[PDB]
From Swiss-Prot, chains A, B, C:
Subunit structure and binding partners: Homo- and heterohexamers.
Tissue expression as described in the entry: Expressed in young seedlings early after germination.
Gene3D superfamilies given in the database record: Glycosidases (3.20.20.80)
Main location: plastid
UniProt protein name: 4-hydroxy-7-methoxy-3-oxo-3,4-dihydro-2H-1,4-benzoxazin-2-yl glucoside beta-D-glucosidase 1b, chloroplastic
Broad class of enzyme this protein falls into: hydrolase
Subcellular location field: Plastid, Chloroplast
Active-site residues (renumbered): E180 (proton donor), E396 (nucleophile)
Note: Wheat is a hexaploid with three different genomes that contains at least four genes coding for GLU1: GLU1A (AC Q1XIR9), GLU1B (AC Q1XH05), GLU1C (AC Q1XH04) and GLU1D (AC D5MTF8). The monomers can aggregate in diverse combinations, reflecting the several isozymes found in the native enzyme described in PubMed:10750901. The hexameric structure is required for activity toward DIMBOA-beta-D-glucoside.
Source species of the chain: Triticum aestivum (Wheat)
This enzyme's EC code(s): 3.2.1.182, 3.2.1.21
Residues reported to bind a beta-D-glucoside: Q32, H134, N179, E180, Y323, E396, W444, E451, W452, F460
Annotated catalysed reactions: Hydrolysis of terminal, non-reducing beta-D-glucosyl residues with release of beta-D-glucose; DIMBOA beta-D-glucoside + H2O = DIMBOA + D-glucose; DIBOA beta-D-glucoside + H2O = DIBOA + D-glucose
Domain of life where this protein originates: Eukaryota
Length: 491, 491, 491
């Protein structure tokens, strides 16, 4: 136990299921892998500060001071990509490494680092896809005005994005402004389990001085305004050759109705609106979902007409970060129910078990990843049918192997990860067969890394990081399958 | 002009399109046909009072003092039904004729009248279906406590319903508690064009001392509570033989999205929720649609758990009163839009013309009846798929011939009405073929009658009332088609 | 007014909706743009003669003496194509410029002109598609034997086509023999509104000495025989490398049944047979539609077996010239109906309004272009399902901005044209998704031009021709959208 049935061998995807232009890759983020947290002039991020001031808020009491040491070891990351035959690497730029004070003087050592990584990727026939921000805010701006809670973040972000465009845009042609705004707003400002660790008085987070009903929406609104400003600038000044693309990457769960009835059908649409539509609908039509405005009202800021027009059609490419699905169970509006957390505003509870008593799918290791590839195909067809079928990349997809799971004693023997990934790659094929414009699949993660409030205890890598042997990269079974899948010539 | 294309002859329904148990009939209401407004002890209704105090609020300055004089001439109504071969007559009981003071002593002359009509119908092999209330509130209760705006209406209604059950239930086996609660709430308390004629200060109605954002919902809430009390009583004490049925009859428009986009898809669902779900969803699940609660909030009263349980599953039969359809056009929530009328709360405007510039269908006479039979089939399949496929009767369906329409110079030559009715009867067949549990079709109206704020200027009858020749009943072309359709033996 | 709803921004096509080989372009014709009508030895065409002898038959009393002056200004046409990022230009060769006397000595100045245009296109990475004849008959042949009414046109055309193949075929690899034979036969010989302007005695055209029941079919028969001879020659002598293609371009309207009944279903098939099948069915199977032979009989010439075999499978590529759709309304055969115009022979009237009284779609400017993109998808699926799914190019598609339309005061602000074109490009995507072999979309027109009997009063261009400023080319809003769509590098 617990029952883990693998695909039959004839059901395993082959590279030629996908056309020649389809892109397989892997993703990381700066705080999760780089280390060198204070090296060569780098200033502290909100994640540096959060870990150093509230260390107990990380599961295993670790932090990203060193992580996988990719600041020094990036050539081994490149080698792992090459060895697996990946065509794309999606990585993030550390704002605090580039602009130690958030604003002002650029750190040339930071510029030099990303240039080396970019040039090495290109030397090795791997295309760089760059996430500009991945939760990674300079603590200087957090101290100065409250970071994403203040409007000043909009212009400061724009100027940081411009440094990235100016320095890297001659070679980097594909950009994501923000990664997982919904996760970030919920966890950083609703539950407060993520940096800067804020929540309402009386709640259990590092800093219970916020407002779990308001601060998530304030932060999300500034993200969207920052995104709109950066894209306007990009399209006006940094796409002169017409061959660059900029978008946003969204965390998305699939949803099924908890019970077969029109009420859970309605709840399911509210859940998708809340999880996905919150940030996707603004970049599509220039406003939040109607459901959210009707339920959240004055706690959800209004866009001006100028802002609406700037936001509408502001993505060339959409990233979907998909792991799992939930059942959506209707909650009635009544005096017996009063929202206290931002997620309460959907009036739909996310359930791991459905009306018949069954889990949505098999657990994969970490508590929240239940396997349900159907959910991904469903979301991709929503993108197709509802939102105009924009170009979609799966920019994260994968599972954790968890320390203490006795069904996973050899960290290299990740047949469960491999099976999960094969099933989701097959689910992408299903969506493509049904007309969804899906352009690539990027596994999270390239290498085991710092899993936020769970530290190193959750390993998401295709490639093992041997923390006791100098952070050496070792290909897992899943990685070696990708070598075969991608027809990498053998030694 | 204007273009009115008729069905091809092979597309005209035949009686055998429907099974042997399907019921064809016609409908009327007490204020619209009875006259004798103050005869034999009858007390005044809100419609008596409205017309007598604000006569100018009726188009042609008429009222229902005499109407079709069916109080004296009901045998001619029965004869018209028989001559057309109708199997059902749906008529209403005048509360103020039965209980002149709303409460207290029953008027035996009122009882005697309905007994004669019921017995004549049964003598003539026509089944009576009885609407208990059709907008027809005793002015005594209006004066005493504000009628449907006060909770006292709930018990007073229950006691009136009980008088009807006690006196007529040995012979009448099919009941509708209320007719068109949505029309009544919108027009009587929102726009105020109908009795008692109330609306917000500054609006143009007889009594601008109300609140068009609140009074419609207060009135509708009491209707639902009154319905729940009457049905509980009926099922406990007046269905001992197990063969009686009680339900409610709803005015419903079909809706199509104004423009092909997910936003007007969403608007269309809000329009259906507002028009149909407002009263239907309470009698199905025991609460209002979620959409309405989310948009109306404190202006929409809450049900107690006891009330919810009483309301859920409180209809044996559903009546649908269908005339026409609209395009539903999304309205955004923003500072630029502030509801002032209850209908504003759907955030969906009802449009007669769609995105391509075309009317939804041909005009039929009166300004609001655009022909669109597709809309009826669509609503019937919603009943099937969403609300459990309860037994449905089309309890009103038809068109007006309007005074001054030069395309309708002979009031008996109603080929346009006939064509409309044939097309809607065919639309019911379509729904039945698709599995909808539709049990009958009742034309509105049996006879030309008092059309509320339009007076006698709109003629809806299968049977002409010759107002200059003693209110004589004369069969129109449509009526004579029903004689043929129903295989009535000829003289 | 009048209501013009635009696509939602997420519904606007993107270039990547189409595969890498799909071709976007624009079209013109020689008489409509070239001017220089008598320059460098060019002889007069039937259109020169028609305008110079019956000037009043042109709306605004203009002609194509100068047009857009593309004889001198073709480099600006090329520049406009390049600026929009178009990959194909479809233009026509003026027969009377190449062979001033129709037959005999070739005009080397004419040859030199087309060589310059071809070479400039190729220098600018634009592929030339060449229409050999576009209504453009030498008046010498018209005077000599009645042009397309005489069999001699067949060989004379063949010899002209051969001059084009010999001189241009080393570089031009894609050819259309004839453009819009159905429009030409109807308007030039039925109604007579187009050159040479012939119709039956008693009708209102310049020369009422013809026969509107016969001359259209005689002319069309010679077109088909000329096409068959030119293609036989081409395939035998001018496709030695195997990489050239030759076809024909057909004007086509979509049709819907006027009323839902089997009779208008039948009428709709006769309308499509008459409009499209007249010329398409011969090049597919080698005979006219059966419907036309059954109704037209002796007025429709027979093909010999040799001719049938030559015609069958004589197109490598099909062009569809699509603007609009109509309702098709059945006409009975009876003594009360006697054809007088060739179009009467379909026994199906083309109606702009349907049975419900609604226009088929919104008017776009000129009286005959009602927007109905569905109609194009429908026709493309007929090509797929009925006629073997040959390679199809949309070789014309667009709208006119009309002088005096107060809803179009700035001739550059053609958002209505842009919306129409986006919707039709989306309709082509729909057809492709459904398996139709559609290979390109060419907007009519590249530049505003001479719109036949309407003169310059109808502007169809992506690119404005400023007639008061030296015939300068100015990109309209639609043109600038194509620059973005095609990712043209910016200055
Ligand atoms: O719990 N989640 O749904 C969820 C989603 C994305 C995430 O990136 C994380 N996370 O990093 O802990 C958590
Ligand atoms: O305007 N309406 O939708 C509407 C509906 C039902 C009705 O009964 C009436 N009415 O009696 O005037 C009007
Ligand atoms: O009226 N038409 O259907 C129609 C079609 C194609 C055409 O090219 C023209 N035209 O040039 O006037 C007219
Ligand atoms: C997406 O999810 C993974 C797994 O939770 C995180 O580690 C990444 O930072 C986030 F982008
Ligand atoms: C349903 O509609 C008809 C026509 O508007 C009214 O006359 C009836 O009273 C109502 F029940
Ligand atoms: C196709 O139609 C356009 C618009 O009517 C004409 O100008 C062209 O000559 C014809 F090819």
């Amino acid at each position: 136990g617990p029952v883990f049935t693998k695909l039959k061998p004839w059901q395993i995807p082959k590279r030629d299921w996908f056309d020649k232009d389809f892109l397989f890759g892997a993703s990381t983020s700066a705080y999760q892998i780089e280390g060198a947290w204070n090296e060569d002039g780098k200033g502290p991020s909100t994640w540096d500060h959060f870990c150093h001031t509230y260390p107990e808020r990380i599961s295993d009491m670790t932090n990203g001071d060193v992580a996988a040491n990719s600041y020094h070891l990036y050539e081994e990351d490149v080698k792992a990509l090459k060895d697996m035959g990946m065509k794309v690497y999606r990585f993030s730029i550390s704002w605090s490494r580039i602009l130690p004070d958030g604003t002002g003087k650029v750190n040339q050592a930071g510029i030099d680092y990303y240039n080396k990584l970019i040039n090495s990727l290109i030397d090795n026939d791997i295309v760089p896809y760059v996430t500009i921000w991945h939760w990674d805010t300079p603590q200087a701006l957090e101290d100065k005005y409250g970071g994403f809670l203040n409007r000043q973040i909009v212009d400061d972000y724009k100027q940081f994005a411009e440094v990235c465009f100016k320095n890297f845009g001659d070679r980097v042609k594909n950009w994501f402004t923000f990664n997982e705004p919904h996760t970030y707003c919920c966890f950083s400002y609703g539950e407060g389990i993520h940096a800067p660790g804020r929540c309402s008085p009386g709640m259990d987070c590092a800093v219970p001085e916020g407002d779990s009903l308001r601060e998530p929406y304030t932060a999300g609104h500034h993200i969207l305004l920052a995104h709109a400003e950066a894209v306007q600038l990009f399209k006006a000044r940094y796409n002169m050759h017409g061959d660059s693309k900029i978008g946003m990457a969204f965390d998305v769960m699939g949803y099924e109705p908890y019970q077969d009835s029109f009420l859970d059908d309605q709840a399911r649409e509210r859940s998708i609106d809340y999880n996905m539509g919150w940030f996707l609908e603004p970049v599509v039509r220039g406003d939040y979902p109607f459901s959210m405005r009707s339920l959240i009202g004055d706690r959800l800021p209004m866009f001006t007409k100028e802002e609406q027009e700037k936001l509408a059609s502001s993505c060339d490419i959409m990233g979907l970060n998909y792991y799992t699905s939930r059942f959506s169970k209707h909650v009635d509006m009544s005096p017996d129910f009063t929202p206290t957390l931002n997620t309460d505003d959907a009036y739909a509870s996310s359930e791991t078990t459905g009306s018949d008593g069954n889990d949505i799918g098999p657990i994969t290791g970490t508590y929240w990843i239940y396997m349900y590839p159907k959910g991904l195909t469903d979301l991709l067809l929503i993108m197709k049918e509802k939102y105009g079928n924009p170009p979609v990349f799966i920019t994260e997809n994968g599972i954790a192997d968890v320390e203490g799971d006795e069904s996973m004693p050899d960290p290299l023997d990740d047949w469960k990860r491999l099976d999960y990934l094969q099933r989701h790659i097959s689910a992408v094929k299903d969506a493509i067969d049904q007309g969804a414009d899906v352009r690539g699949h990027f596994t999270w993660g390239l290498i085991d890394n710092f899993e936020w409030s769970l530290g190193y205890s959750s390993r998401f890598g295709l490639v093992y990081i041997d923390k006791n042997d100098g952070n050496k990269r070792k290909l897992k079974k899943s990685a070696k399958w990708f070598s075969k899948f991608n027809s990498v010539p053998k030694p």
